[PDB]
Amino acid sequence: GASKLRAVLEKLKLSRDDISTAAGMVKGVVDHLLLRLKCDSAFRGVGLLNTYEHVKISAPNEFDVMFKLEVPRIQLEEYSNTRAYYFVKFKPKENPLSQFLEGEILSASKMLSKFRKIIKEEINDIKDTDVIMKRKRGGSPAVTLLISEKISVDITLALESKSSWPASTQEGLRIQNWLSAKVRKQLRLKPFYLVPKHAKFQEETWRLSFSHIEKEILNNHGKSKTCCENKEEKCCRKDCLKLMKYLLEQLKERFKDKKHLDKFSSYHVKTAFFHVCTQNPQDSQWDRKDLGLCFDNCVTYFLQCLRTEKLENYFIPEFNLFSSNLIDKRSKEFLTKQIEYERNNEFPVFD
Numbered sequence: 528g529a530s531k532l533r534a535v536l537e538k539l540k541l542s543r544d545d546i547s548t549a550a551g552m553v554k555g556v557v558d559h560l561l562l563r564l565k566c567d568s569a570f571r572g573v574g575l576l577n578t579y580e581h582v583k584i585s586a587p588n589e590f591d592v593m594f595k596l597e598v599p600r601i602q603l604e605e606y607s608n609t610r611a612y613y614f615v616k617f618k619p620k621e622n623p624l625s626q627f628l629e630g631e632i633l634s635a636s637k638m639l640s641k642f643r644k645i646i647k648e649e650i651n652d653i654k655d656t657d658v659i660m661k662r663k664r665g666g667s668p669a670v671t672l673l674i675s676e677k678i679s680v681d682i683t684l685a686l687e688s689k690s691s692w693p694a695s696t697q698e699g700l701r702i703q704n705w706l707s708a709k710v711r712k713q714l715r716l717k718p719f720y721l722v723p724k725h726a727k728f729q730e731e732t733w734r735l736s737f738s739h740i741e742k743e744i745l746n747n748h749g750k751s752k753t754c755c756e757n758k759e760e761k762c763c764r765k766d767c768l769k770l771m772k773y774l775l776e777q778l779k780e781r782f783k784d785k786k787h788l789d790k791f792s793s794y795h796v797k798t799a800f801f802h803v804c805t806q807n808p809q810d811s812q813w814d815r816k817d818l819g820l821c822f823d824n825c826v827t828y829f830l831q832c833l834r835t836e837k838l839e840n841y842f843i844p845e846f847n848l849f850s851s852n853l854i855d856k857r858s859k860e861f862l863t864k865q866i867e868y869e870r871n872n873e874f875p876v877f878d
């Protein structure tokens with residue numbers, strides 16, 4: 528019941544709070560890479576996007592960092608009505624990414640090749656730690672590093688644009704009735720990001736990225752400004768999200784051997800959870816004592832998304848993350864049956 532859910536959260540918390548040098552070993556290797564990257568004229572603006580960055584909770588030795596780089600005077604062209612994938616053009620100063628142009632369009636291929644080369648140069652330059660660099664599965668993540676053992680670090684490269692968000696976001700981020708119109712504008716004044724990624728041959732498109740929004744909302748998540756600052760206003764929003772990510776991660780681990788769940792990842796969970804926040808904007812709909820009901824309502828909504836094959840991207844509402852062409856009926860049905868079994872049995876995977 529809600530009692531088991533609380534126990535799971537307690538153990539997830541105790542794993543987080545424990546003394547770990549892995550952060551230190553990773554920060555040591557990352558600060559090395561950021562400096563050597565800064566010596567190359569093409570990557571002088573590079574910096575960490577966010578100064579606990581883990582894709583997984585069940586694998587804590589696995590880190591995820593993102594190197595932002597501003598590209599000002601930026602021009603974008605929507606690719607094939609995908610609403611999310613774009614060509615990156617420029618606008619008479621010397622563009623420091625000149626070596627990376629293939630026509631007017633900036634090449635992700637070229638730019639990642641110099642990215643990896645510099646990082647590959649610096650990994651063999653470190654004598655303190657034995658760091659192994661893996662090879663190009665995709666491009667996002669750009670580089671995977673194995674520090675000592677058990678420590679793996681996925682470094683993604685991302686352009687930054689400090690201009691208005693593209694017009695396909697106009698109806699997105701629908702937090703007005705929950706966090707307010709004022710906050711929605713504040714957020715839309717923040718930069719946006721682009722990371723390399725193909726749609727489905729190989730065009731040179733970039734996918735919009737909003738990696739920096741979630742932490743802004745998670746750490747100020749109530750309709751009330753004092754939500755979760757006193758005993759009278761403890762809510763369970765953050766606990767519901769943790770549980771949903773942990774449920775998905777434990778199922779992916781359980782069924783890692785077959786491919787059924789490989790198409791799902793925690794941003795599907797986050798998308799669905801924040802849609803539930805939009806549907807339920809009042810802090811009183813997330814009272815701590817209703818953890819069991821609130822979480823069950825998150826599960827149920829995510830399942831409805833699976834069965835109906837509709838999960839609208841939080842930022843670009845016309846982009847359906849669960850459409851037929853992205854995830855086949857069979858995978859969604861398999862995830863549906865796993866989660867429904869779990870719920871019918873008070874989640875044995877949480878143990």
Ligand SMILES: Cn1ccc(-c2ccc(Cl)c(CNc3nc4[nH]c(Cc5ccccc5)cc(=O)n4n3)c2)n1
Nearest residue numbers: 611735736737738741794797798801840841843846
């Ligand atoms: C990593 N991946 C793989 C595929 C995509 C992707 C596909 C299509 C579009 Cl249309 C986009 C659009 N861009 C985009 N959408 C999100 N959604 C969240 C999750 C979230 C929701 C609500 C509040 C906070 C966070 C995280 C994130 O970083 N993004 N980035 C992203 N991304």
Ligand SMILES: [Zn+2]
Nearest residue numbers: 749754755762
């Ligand atoms: Zn709260």
